[PDB]
Ligand binder design. Structure first.
Ligand code: TKP
Length: 168
């Protein structure tokens, strides 16, 4: 129904590097830093010169100088969700399957994950995440508008707790 992730929202989820990223708007693409390709001079055809790239705490944002997805409306990127919010992780698999995972979000905090400092939010799954799912967006529908508040970065060994990286 209307309040499940619509097809256009899923169409923002894009295979990228060793995971996924997400078109927040025609010009802004977000992902988790560790999936990003290394040593490239262009992204989606555009030279790095034309791209503002902001990377911190495992969150990466690309702001392009051209409309890359002109078909899309701009949506709100927030710095995480409030504790208790139920978000969906929009997981695409290479098979083509779409797997919206319901997650109850916890607190925003700094975490050390395999040596890297993550500006993260943990959440409890309400179906699990696997290697290759990173970059997948954490989204929720606030009244009439969809909000994106993080990108998938990690899961506990049990798989029952996930972490998304959030923007400063
Ligand atoms: C996506 O690349 C992958 C998704 C994970 C894999 C298994 N299920 C998932 O959801 N993410 C990772 O493998 C992640 C990579 C690090 C790399 C450096 C930057 C941060 C992300 N590692 C990971 O999830 O580690 C799992 C633990 C148990 C080692 C872990 C340690 C510390 C905190 C947590 Cl929540 C988990």
């Amino acid at each position: 129904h209307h309040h499940h992730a619509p097809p256009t929202l899923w169409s923002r989820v894009t295979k990228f590097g060793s995971g996924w990223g997400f078109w927040v708007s025609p010009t802004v693409f977000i992902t988790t830093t560790h999936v990003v390709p290394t040593g490239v001079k262009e992204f989606f055809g555009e030279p790095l010169s034309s791209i503002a790239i902001h990377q911190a705490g495992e969150f990466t944002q690309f702001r392009f100088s051209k409309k890359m997805r002109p078909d899309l409306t701009g949506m709100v990127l927030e710095e995480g969700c409030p504790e208790g919010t139920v978000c969906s992780v929009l997981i695409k698999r290479d098979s083509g399957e779409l797997l919206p995972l319901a997650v109850r979000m916890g607190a925003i905090a700094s975490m050390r994950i395999q040596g890297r400092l993550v500006h993260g939010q943990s959440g409890m799954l309400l179906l699990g995440t696997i290697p290759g799912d990173c970059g997948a967006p954490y989204v929720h529908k606030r009244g009439n508008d969809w909000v994106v508040c993080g990108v998938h970065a990690a899961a506990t060994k049990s798989g029952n707790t996930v972490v998304c990286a959030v923007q400063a």
